[PDB]
Structures are given as structure tokens and as C-alpha cells.
Design a protein around this ligand. Structure first.
Ligand SMILES: Nc1nc(-n2cc(C(=O)O)c(=O)c3cc(F)c(N4CC(O)C4)c(Cl)c32)c(F)cc1F
Ligand SMILES: Nc1nc(-n2cc(C(=O)O)c(=O)c3cc(F)c(N4CC(O)C4)c(Cl)c32)c(F)cc1F
Ligand SMILES: [Cl-]
Ligand SMILES: [Cl-]
Ligand SMILES: [Mg+2]
Ligand SMILES: [Mg+2]
Ligand SMILES: [Mg+2]
Ligand SMILES: [Mg+2]
Ligand SMILES: [Mg+2]
Ligand SMILES: [Mg+2]
Lengths: 720, 720
DNA sequence: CATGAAT
DNA sequence: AGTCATTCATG
DNA sequence: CGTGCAT
DNA sequence: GACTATGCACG
């Protein structure tokens, strides 16, 4: 891990703490090996304000930092044994970078404060952009750290130029990395000072302590979800910044991003950004259900390069999960090969597997081509991506979501498609509908793992408030055997539970003989179904055993609802009512936007058809006219002046291929006129009348339900 | 690793040896867990005929194989103690599958012979193809094992529904793996017998002993490089085959594949198949030098999805190598990021790096769009790929090639572009030119790492025969110091040598004081320069030290030429003359094919233009003609039949846009006729006259030389 | 012992 | 994101 | 713990 | 191609 400097010299030597090994390789290649040491970080550093102390000192990352600094730790910290004058934190300029800077600084504040206080801890600022007027002798190369140093740089030593947009240190090489962020002549750093020991203490504890509530509160008050962030103009050479304002600039940046753009679903389409990208990318590449499977590696690589600048494993894992019918109630990806099991064994690696969108996932994307949904630039401004999908079925409830953010988490269980549509259809007709009535249609969750759900009162509370605890209990049956004996047989288990770990834990009950009567525990499951068999001993009390298992193993668990999604850019704890009204409001924007799109298209076609019908009446004249003209533009002009065609009509006439003169059937063009007028009226009516629009919204939801509805799997029971 | 059956029963229990953990999972899912155990193989198994025995008995994979079978190791081998009645080798239906089958059967024949003799060792047989689709409720599934059975299977009173072509076990769901290869009632096996103890010991020692030359010789006589092999018409449940016939077909099929299709370069373009696929795929995706870099993962994924059905890592590694200017004399891929170093420190993973083709790589692909080169069906018959690139420069000698196959290896060093071209141009003019004259132009190799090459005679022998041993010696110089001291300074090192490992091995000489005089070894290399300093003690013998280091470290090495390439589908050991002559013959085919291509295109344009000019004269009749006609097709018919236009001409007229009738400038069309006629003459002359053709071949090679020539890097010296 | 496409 | 095994030919 | 997108 | 660490919130 550690690459040391050739020469000891505590007066000038530098320890580069580099985000990741790949970048650490770059830094090792680009350094001045005489006084610059490199310690790469294996990802996310332990939180030394949350974790215990058993853990802090068994952490390999932390120990080799202490070893190398060579000053001891904490209580016994000697500043002049330190082998470095500067400790330099050099991370990607992304938000996970800011999080890493955050976690280090908290370690140094707590266990190496003499070193922070004496201004020996810095942060390297790598460039966001590198401009290149390709060639121009060598390359004509300059760098830039703000939106504003970039605008400055559009002038300068050329125009019609290349602009690379840096997403990490890993995309930089040693000469680039040296010039811009490592060489003391040229580099810009920020030195970390303490301004108030009291104020900087309260900052570190609210952000990094195990108290969640103050953190969620800090985020509520400080983080502007709705607005941007001002560019923070770049200053030359070293500059000073409080531990207080660094920790809050960086952690706020992280928090906002992981809330809005990672771990939490959108309330409308129920997708995390990575899942939305998977679906969009795969659909744009025609990787649909109707067409052939396509190697996972190809899909993943296109997603990563076009939309999602992150690991191929994170993307592949997310893709695989969307194909697992014990995780998702209505799978969005079909995958050939080993996509895992309930025993949680590894899916085949992506070289092996192949994939495509499910039929139903087609319906989340339905009408995306008709400007139904806001798009934005991808990470490199090469390409647009949807911020939300059309969502012709209410995926959030149907498939649920489970995620862990900053200040917030979420748990939304899967639900029955038909039931969720039923509720939504009622609510379209009854905007003020209350829970009691909605639950006649949506009585509760419907896990793809089935089993028994207990706590009708608590479902109600979760559907009211977004929170509640419910009991999920495996489905069981007794069977008789040789010697009169019994065995408990398990056929459905609780959501999110590992079958093999459950079996093991039951077998440990047997072994430790916590309850009298267990003979043997066999998993007898196979490719066709789940079946765990708990063979009992001669005359053992079936009931006493079963009840011990439910109590003391995960044969029975509590599901805790915690229904948080993103609504108007803000995290938001929500019950069934805001969830369904948001969906409905969404489909309304979609159906109206789709209607406007198709209507504008029909109008243009109608104006042309009108034109073509007229041209046939004067075809001989139109052709002589075109022959008499000098060029295209002149022909169009003549057509307008002589015969009052529009620009649109004239352009269309003038670009007809000669063979089109073979079809001059005006009757057929008149049937098409009538059909277009009919259609424009229908579409106008939708845009003109909310109820006409809502009736369509319901018609479509019903079609979906008819096509994709499947029986409930989880049974419901009132008392818990 | 091992997943055991639930119930002991040496009568019918089965051990599945599956190729890969991913297929091992697939098998663990699809099994009958009562009697089928799963041992997954971590790829290529140790060769038991070659390895020591110290090394064999410490192989984790073998140890867990003898522990599980529970009988001991040949001699101590108690067949009556066996935990299984069938041992079933389950590998992919690819050539590396056949290789593993080969490697295990040597282990069993050699350390467990009673098992093989009793017919307790079986083979996988998984299906090559799967047929049909009725979609959600399908009743449309049928598996097939041969070419013959597929045609048979395409008949079915229904439609042409969809065909899947399996490439391994990774792509089969647990359901399909059971029905086809794991259920005893349905599956097909090969039982392995020893028909002749004598003939099966000759066959296993020829294929798997230390002796290469017998294996080479076996391959020469038995393996047909220019022919196919017509499938073994498939039988039912169990079938017997001798250990002699199995090892022979299995290893013959692997051997052939890795000679022709993996490890050995094509004599014309100098590329291994993976390199060609990288170049072609990247070029097809417009991932060229002139356009933006593009994420490596995206490149790799499309290579894997479209052309190369192998691991992402093997593809990235190959791709990365082509970017490294200390491995390739003229790099074929440009790569932003950590693409390694001379210290062999790992490159950034493909998630970080981004790449494109170099400019000169463009010259390998020059004129691929012009039917200059034979294409084949890719691996899943969905898309065509080139079997060889145009190669507008002689890449085989320029970038060389280093590979290991079966019976053969290759070692072709890099050469200087200008010099190879000079030799090639001379030989175009002098087909009979002999080595002494060619070496005036091409005196020897030019390593990208420079250094000093010693051995004119041996160069000559390599250039004559394909084989030769030369000395490659680091470039050194002696620098004076303070206080009566010298240091040796190394500035270039031998090709293929890891700088850090060399520095280490020199330092260990100091530490063990194997030779006296070394004060310190210091790698003083930076981003700009290679510089190693061996500082010597006051009054040490510097000649004695330097000579010790040359002899006993890699400060100097032997390079052994072993110039083997694929010539006409067969491996061939070749000197400079057959190498250069193959290149010139290839360029001839390319230039001729190109010229035909461009001429057919110019002739078509010309006929169309003749047609357009003629049309003017009959515009009114043409137009009237076109309105009368029933459709496009009919209109063309009348044009031909009435007016004696060709199909090409009629198609062009009938698709003119109406505004083209404004234009009556026959003169510009006539300038174009004339220019096309000139060009058709130039091109026909190239096709018609070998010297015209060869003179063009020379003109282009000189252009490439002028554009891309660089100075020699390695110096040459006559005395070893 | 290490080279480079493969498992 | 870095580790760890094997094949094959060769000196 | 173990969940699931990230480093 | 498997294996190992971390953050974040929540029972
Ligand atoms: N589990 C399995 N792995 C491999 N395999 C594949 C590698 C690759 O695709 O580039 C690789 O680099 C690799 C390195 C190894 F060090 C290695 N081993 C360490 C031991 O566990 C074996 C193995 Cl095995 C490796 C395989 F080809 C097949 C597998 F099932
Ligand atoms: N070297 C570095 N690795 C990681 N990293 C990335 C993983 C991924 O992309 O999916 C992963 O699955 C992963 C698992 C680990 F168990 C793990 N650790 C075991 C310890 O050595 C740390 C690390 Cl660190 C892991 C990183 F994100 C950044 C890295 F530099
Ligand atoms: Cl039209
Ligand atoms: Cl034209
Ligand atoms: Mg990153
Ligand atoms: Mg991972
Ligand atoms: Mg419990
Ligand atoms: Mg394979
Ligand atoms: Mg590898
Ligand atoms: Mg030597």
C-alpha cells in the first residue's frame, strides 16, 4: 500500500493520501520520489466518531496511517516524531471524494489534533476541466477549476477546441497530475485550520456522531435541495479554511447528492438513478423483451460510458437485482444464467450472463419518445437522459425500494399490481379518498416471497404516516411420517431473508437444544420450489417448537415500513395518499405532454395532406412551374406566390421523389384528412377537459392491470 | 468449494466437476441434492504428467478432489472406499472446455486408474443450441447437439421462431442445465474406458509430457489446419469412448484453436485475434484518434458482445498492452490514465481509463470498408468480422509478437518502421533479394526500450531461419563522484524486463555481498526519464561489478528469436524473406481488391450520370410516363422497356426530387463524366499491370514511412 | 522465473 | 479494486 | 447484523 | 472470477 520517499526529511516531506489504488498508481508515477510518499485508500475510510475503539484500532487503513506518520496517536501524539511536514488529502473532485475528505479530517481532528492545529493537513485541488486546441505545436493545454475559469478559457490560445471534463484522478496521468495538483510550484492546496475549538467540535459531532436526528435536522436547515451551489471562485497557491466550514461544505455536498441522486427512489416512477439509467440505456439500445438477449458486459459498459460514471460492479449488481423475482414483485430485467438464489449465492459474473428489459419495464418507458418527461445532460454533456420515466404503472409501490442515504433511509415493500391500480383508479375518481376506503383496494404489501403478514392496524399506520411495524411469518405445514413422527415444513419465507442462513440458524437451535424436540433440519428445496423440513423427534410438541422458532429465529420477522422518496427534489416521508396523488399528477403531465406532441405532429401532416390534395388538381401546372424555376428555393417561392402554398407545403412538394407521381389518389388523401381531423379533436378534448384526460388515465391503467395482473402471494391477518 | 450431497450412498452418488464457479452455482441450483455433489474447478487444472509431485500434492484443487472422493491416490487407491459411483466432468462446449477434460483425465488415468478402468468416469455433454419461442406460455423448446440435428430441428409446423447458440454453461438457467445434462433419465453422457493400456499410455504421454517435439510432431500428422471436422452424429443416454480417442480429439481441437485462434499472430497484419477484434470494434464504433476518448469499459464490452466471447479482463489486458510504448514500438491504442509502468505496477481498472486507436492503427484498418479483405461470421452468426486487416504498414515486424500456444511458441521482436518499409520496398523491386542485401536496410530489431543488441551473425541466422540468440545489454555510462568514487548509471534496459524487479535484484547483490564494491542502488527514474544509479564504494573494481551485474542480473539478457506466425491457417517458422513476401502478396490483394471496389463505384456513378444527361432530352415523356405507372417498380419497368435505361439508371431517375428538374446544367455533369473516366482508367491500369500495381504499393509504403518514421532506439554491435 | 492470451 | 492458481513453449 | 448503491 | 474493507439509517 505505502510507497515511501527515498529520503527522510520531516521539514519538507509530504504524505499523499490518495482516493483509491488506481489513482495512487498515477500519483506514484507523477511524484517527486525524493520527498513525496503515497498511501492509497481502499475506498471509504472508517468513521472514527461513530465506530467504537476495538474497531478503530483493528482498522488496517487507520493503523498504516499511524505507522507511517510515525508520531503515535491521540493521547500520546508527538508532533516532532512526524515524518512529514504536510499531509495531503487528494481525492477525486466528486461527492464521494468530499465524503472521504470528511472522514479523514474527522480522524485527524480527534486523534491527531496537534497536527491539524499546526496547519500540517492540506487538501489537493485537482482540475475539473482541461482544454486542448488539438495540436497547435504539441497540444496547447491549459486547466480550469470553476465554471468561470472555463469561460475565461474559451477565449485564449484558440477556438474550435477539445474540452475534457474530469470525473476522477484515475483519468489523469502522471505528467498531468504533477503539473496540476502535485508539483508545489504550480499546485493549489487548501490548508485546514481550527478557528473555534468549540464550534468545530459541534460541526464534527452532528455530521459524524451516531445521533441521526441532529444530522437530519442540520440537513433540513442547511442543505438547499431546491437550489444550486455558488461556484466558490478558485484562489492561487495555498489558502486557509476552517475545519468548521470545510466539514459542512463537503458533507452537505455529499448528503444532498446521496439523498437526491443515489439511494432514494423518485416518488413518481419508484426508481433510483442507477435503475432509471439501466432501463433507459438498455431501451435506447433496443435491448427489449421482444428481441434477443445481449451480453451483460455490453449493457453495463454502455451504461457506464453514456450515463452512470461509477463502478461496473455497482451497475451490474443493481441490474441483477432487477431480474431477481424474490426481490422484485414485477421484474424489470430478464437475465439468462445464474442471477443468484435465495441462498444468496453469487450471480454469474457479467461476462457469463445476458439480459434484456422485461415486457412490463417497456411500460415504464412507454411514450418517452414523445417529450413526456424532462431530460437533462449526462455527466459529460454529450447526451440527454430522462430525470424520470413515463411510468405507465406505479412502480414505487409495486416494486418498492430499500435504500440508505444520509440523514434518511427508506423501506417501501412490494405490492400487488392490480391492487395498486385499483386504489389509484378509485383515487382518480375520488381525490379526497381516505385510507380506510383505499385499503378496500390496497389491503397491504404483497411480497414476491409470499408468507403471512400480520398487523392490519400497523399497515394502516404505515399507509397513513409512512411508518409502522408489521409481522411477516413463514408459511408452514405439518406432515406425518414413519413412527407416527411429525415434521414442520416451510414453503414461504419472509422478504429479504437468506434461506441458507435461516436453515443454519434453525439447525443451531437444534444443536444448542434451545428447545426440546428437533431431530434434523433438511433444506429440500430445488429448482422447482422452496421446502425446508424440520424433522422432529418421537412425540415432541410440534407447537412448542414452531413457536420457539418464530420467536427466536427469522422464521418470523418484523417488517418496518419507512416510506421515504424524493418529491420535488426533497426527501419526504409519505403514506399511500401522497404516493398515489404524486403518481396521478405524474401521469397527468405525461398524458397531456404526449397529447400535445401527437397533436402537433397530426397538424403538420394535415397541412401537407391539404397541400398534396390541391397539387393533384394542378399537377401539370405545378410541374411546369418547378421546371420553369432556377433552383429549389426559387421553386418554393414560385409555388407560394403563384398558388399560395405555405412554406411547409412548398418544401414537401418540392422534395417529392418523381415516383410519387404514381399515386395521385385524392380520395385516399381525403380519408387521411378526415382521420387526422378526428384524431386532433380527440387529442384537443384531452388537453381541453381534465375529466376527458383522467378517463384516459384510468382506461390505460386498466389495460395495464388486465395485461400484467397476477394473484396475491402474501396472505394477510389482522391481529399481530 | 465443495457442495456435498445430503445423503451418503456410494451406490449412485455423483460428483460433478464443473468448469467455473459461475457454472458451479448454476449446477448447485439445478441438481438433485440427495445424490449429486458439486465441485467447481477454478479454471485450468494442473497437468499431472508435467508438474513435479511436490507441486502436485500441494495443489489446492487436487487435494480437495482426493479428500472428496475419499479413496487415496494411485497405489494407496481403494476403489471400494469411493464416495461416488459416477464422477462426471462437466465443462463448457468450447475448446478450453475440451482442454480441462484433457487435464483431469490425465490426473485420473495417472493417480486413480481403477476408477477409469471400471467405467466410473463420465463426460458432461451439454447442448450447443436451443430452439423456439411461444413467449410467456411457450410450449416451444428443443435442444440440439450437432449441425445435423439443428437442420432436422428447424422443421416444425409453426414458423421461424428464435434460435440460441450456447457458448458455455454460464448461459444456461438451472432448469435447462437439469433437463439436458444433469437429470440421469434425460441427460447424455460419455463413459470413459481404457480399450488398450499400451495405446492409452503412449497417447497421454505424447499430449501431456515435457517433450514438446513429439507433441508438435503428433499435431503435424494428426491436426488438419486447412480442413474442418464433420460432427460426431449424436447418440443416447450413455456412450463409450476409449481414453485414447477422447484425449486425441479433445487435445487436437484445443491445440488447433490456440495455434490458429489465440496465441500466434497472422503473418500479414501481425495481429492475434483479440488484438484484431479490439482494433476493428473500436474502429467500427468510431473510437479513432481524431475523435474523443471513450470509456474503456464501453469499448471492452462491445468487443466482448460482438466479436470476442472471452473475459473482459483478457480483453482489457490486451488493449492496455497495445497502449504501452515500452511493449509496442508503435502503439495501436492511446489510453488516458494509469496504463501501467515499466515497473509493471498494475494499470487502472477499465472503469477509470478511457481509450481510442492511435493514428497509425488507422493505417492497419485503411480501406476495410472497400471489400479488401476476407470477413467471417462472428461467434453467434449475427455479424461479420475481418479475418485479417489491410495493414498499410508491416505490423508483424514493427510491433513484433510474443505468444505461447500448443506445440509452438513465438518471439518476434519489434523493428524500426522506416527500416522494415525500406526492406519491403527493395524487395518489391527485387523479389529474389537475399538476406545480406535486405540487412543493409534492416540490420536488426529496434526495441521501444532501446538498449544495445549484440550478435550480427545470430541476427542473420534469425533472419534466415526464424531462430537466433542475441544479447541485449542495458545502456550504461560511468559518472565520477566526490571522494574517489564512481557510480554506474543505467538509462535503457532490455525489452520485457521489469525495472523495479531489476533494481531489487541488483540491490540483493549488494546485500548478500556476492560481489564487492556496491554502496547503494537507487532508482532515480521520474515521469521524464529512466535513470538507475549504482553508487560504488571508494576504490571498487567498476569493470568487475558491471560484468557481474551483466552476467548474473537482467542488466543484460539473451533474446531468442522464435519467429512463428500463421501462414495459410498453419503455423510456420519464418525468416525475414517469407515475412516480407507474405506482406507484399497481402498488400497486392488489398490494393487490387480496393481498386476493383473503387472502380465498380465509379462506373455506377458514371452510368447514372450518363442516364441523367440522356433524361434531359426526354423530360416531358419521362414525366408523363411516370404518372401513368402503377407504382415505383412499374415506372422503372417502363423506363427500361420504353427508353433503354438500365436498372441503376432507372432507379436514379425515379428517385430524383422534383426540385432537381430546375437544373439543366449538362456541363457540370460532363466534367464529372470525364473525371470518372480518367479515374476508371487509372484504376483499371492497376488491375491490368502488375508493375503499375507494385509501383502504387511502393508509393504508399513510402508515404507511411515519411509520415510515421522515427529514429532507431537500440544500437547494434557485431561482436557478442 | 517470466513472458501473454486463456480458464 | 487488488490478490491469488493454473496451461502452454522456451531457455 | 444485514440490507443496497457507492468507494 | 471469488474474497475482503468501508459509509449511510434502522430494527
Ligand atoms: N474463479 C475463477 N477464476 C478464474 N480466474 C480468472 C481470471 C480472469 O478472468 O482474468 C484471473 O485473473 C484469475 C486469477 C487468479 F489468480 C485465479 N486463481 C486464484 C485461485 O483461486 C485461482 C483465477 Cl481462478 C482467475 C477462472 F479462470 C475461473 C474461475 F472459476
Ligand atoms: N481497492 C479498492 N477497492 C474498492 N472496492 C470496490 C469494490 C467494487 O467496485 O465493487 C468492491 O467490491 C470492494 C470490496 C472489498 F471487499 C473491498 N475491500 C477489502 C479491503 O481491501 C477493502 C474494496 Cl476496497 C472494494 C474501492 F471502492 C476502492 C479501492 F481502491
Ligand atoms: Cl408525403
Ligand atoms: Cl445526382
Ligand atoms: Mg470515483
Ligand atoms: Mg461489489
Ligand atoms: Mg423472530
Ligand atoms: Mg468458457
Ligand atoms: Mg487476469
Ligand atoms: Mg544476465
Amino acid at each position: 500500500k505505502l510507497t515511501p520517499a527515498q529520503s527522510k526529511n520531516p521539514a519538507k516531506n509530504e504524505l499523499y493520501l490518495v482516493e483509491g489504488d488506481s489513482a495512487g498508481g498515477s500519483a506514484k508515477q507523477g511524484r517527486d520520489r525524493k520527498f513525496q510518499a503515497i498511501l492509497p485508500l481502499r475506498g471509504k475510510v472508517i468513521n472514527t466518531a461513530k465506530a467504537k475503539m476495538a474497531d478503530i484500532l483493528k482498522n488496517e487503513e487507520i493503523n498504516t496511517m499511524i505507522y507511517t506518520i510515525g508520531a503515535g496517536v491521540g493521547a500520546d501524539f508527538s508532533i516532532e516524531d512526524a515524518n512529514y511536514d504536510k499531509i495531503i488529502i487528494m481525492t477525486d473532485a466528486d461527492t464521494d471524494g468530499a465524503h472521504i475528505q470528511t472522514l479523514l479530517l474527522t480522524f485527524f481532528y480527534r486523534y491527531m489534533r496537534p497536527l491539524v492545529e499546526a496547519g500540517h493537513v492540506y487538501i489537493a485541488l485537482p482540475p475539473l476541466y482541461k482544454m486542448s486546441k488539438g495540436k497547435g505545436k504539441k497540444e496547447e493545454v491549459a486547466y480550469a477549476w470553476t465554471d468561470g475559469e472555463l469561460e475565461e478559457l474559451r477565449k485564449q490560445f484558440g477556438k474550435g477546441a477539445t474540452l475534457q471534463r474530469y470525473k476522477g484522478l484515475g483519468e489523469m496521468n502522471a505528467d498531468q497530475l504533477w503539473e496540476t495538483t502535485m508539483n508545489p510550484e504550480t499546485r493549489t492546496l487548501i490548508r485546514v485550520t481550527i478557528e473555534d475549538l468549540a464550534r468545530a467540535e459541534r460541526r464534527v459531532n452532528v455530521l459524524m456522531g451516531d445521533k441521526v436526528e441532529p444530522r437530519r435536522k442540520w440537513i433540513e436547515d442547511n442543505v438547499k435541495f431546491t437550489l444550486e451551489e455558488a461556484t466558490v471562485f478558485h484562489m492561487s497557491n495555498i489558502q486557509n479554511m476552517s475545519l468548521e466550514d470545510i466539514m459542512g461544505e463537503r458533507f452537505g455536498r455529499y448528503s444532498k447528492y446521496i439523498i437526491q441522486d443515489r439511494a432514494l427512489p423518485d416518488i413518481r416512477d419508484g426508481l433510483k438513478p442507477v435503475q432509471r439509467r439501466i432501463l433507459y440505456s438498455m431501451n435506447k439500445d433496443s435491448n427489449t423483451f421482444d428481441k434477443s438477449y445481449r451480453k451483460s458486459a455490453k449493457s453495463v459498459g454502455n451504461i457506464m460510458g453514456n450515463f452512470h460514471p461509477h463502478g461496473d460492479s455497482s451497475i451490474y449488481d443493481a441490474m441483477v437485482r432487477m431480474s431477481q423475482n424474490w426481490k422484485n414483485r414485477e421484474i424489470l430485467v430478464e437475465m439468462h444464467g445464474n442471477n443468484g438464489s435465495m441462498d444468496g449465492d453469487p450471480p454469474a459474473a457479467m461476462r457469463y450472463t445476458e439480459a434484456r428489459l422485461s415486457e412490463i419495464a417497456g411500460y415504464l418507458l412507454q411514450d418517452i419518445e414523445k417529450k413526456t418527461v424532462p431530460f437533462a445532460w449526462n455527466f459529460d454533456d454529450t447526451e440527454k437522459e430522462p430525470t424520470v420515466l413515463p411510468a405507465a404503472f406505479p412502480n414505487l409501490l409495486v416494486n418498492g425500494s430499500t435504500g440508505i442515504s444520509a440523514g434518511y433511509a427508506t423501506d417501501i415493500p412490494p405490492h400487488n399490481l392490480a391492487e395498486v391500480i385499483d386504489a389509484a383508479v378509485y383515487m382518480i375518481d375520488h381525490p379526497t379518498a381516505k385510507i380506510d376506503k383505499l385499503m378496500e383496494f390496497l389491503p397491504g404489501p404483497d411480497f414476491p416471497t409470499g408468507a403471512i403478514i400480520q398487523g392490519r392496524d400497523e399497515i394502516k399506520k404505515a399507509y397513513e404516516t409512512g411508518k409502522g411495524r408489521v409481522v411477516v411469518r413463514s408459511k408452514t405445514e405439518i406432515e406425518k411420517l414413519k413412527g407416527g413422527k411429525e415434521q414442520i415444513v416451510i414453503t414461504e419465507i419472509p422478504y429479504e431473508i437468506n434461506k441458507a442462513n435461516l436453515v443454519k440458524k434453525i439447525d443451531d437451535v437444534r444443536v444448542n437444544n434451545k428447545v426440546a424436540g428437533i431431530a434434523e433440519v433438511r433444506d429440500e428445496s430445488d429448482r422447482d420450489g422452496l421446502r425446508i423440513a424440520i424433522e422432529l423427534k418421537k412425540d415432541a410438541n410440534t407447537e412448542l417448537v414452531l413457536n420457539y422458532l418464530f420467536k427466536y429465529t427469522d422464521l418470523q420477522i418484523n417488517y418496518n415500513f419507512n416510506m421515504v422518496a424524493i418529491d420535488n427534489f426533497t426527501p419526504r416521508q409519505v403514506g399511500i395518499v401522497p404516493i398515489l396523488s404524486s403518481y396521478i399528477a405524474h401521469r397527468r403531465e405525461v398524458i397531456l405532454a404526449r397529447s400535445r406532441f401527437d397533436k402537433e405532429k397530426a397538424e403538420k401532416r394535415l397541412h401537407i395532406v391539404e397541400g398534396l390534395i390541391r397539387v393533384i388538381s394542378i399537377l401539370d401546372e405545378v410541374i411546369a412551374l418547378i421546371r420553369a424555376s432556377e433552383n429549389k428555393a426559387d421553386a418554393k417561392e414560385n409555388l407560394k406566390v403563384s398558388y399560395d402554398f405555405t412554406e411547409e407545403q412548398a418544401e414537401a412538394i418540392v422534395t417529392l421523389q418523381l415516383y410519387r407521381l404514381t399515386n395521385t389518389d385524392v380520395v385516399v388523401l381525403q380519408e387521411e384528412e378526415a382521420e387526422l381531423r378526428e384524431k386532433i379533436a380527440m387529442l384537443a378534448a384531452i388537453i381541453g377537459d381534465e375529466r376527458t384526460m383522467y378517463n384516459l388515465m384510468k382506461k390505460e391503467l386498466r389495460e395495464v392491470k388486465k395485461k400484467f395482473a397476477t394473484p396475491r402471494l402474501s396472505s394477510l391477518e389482522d391481529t399481530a
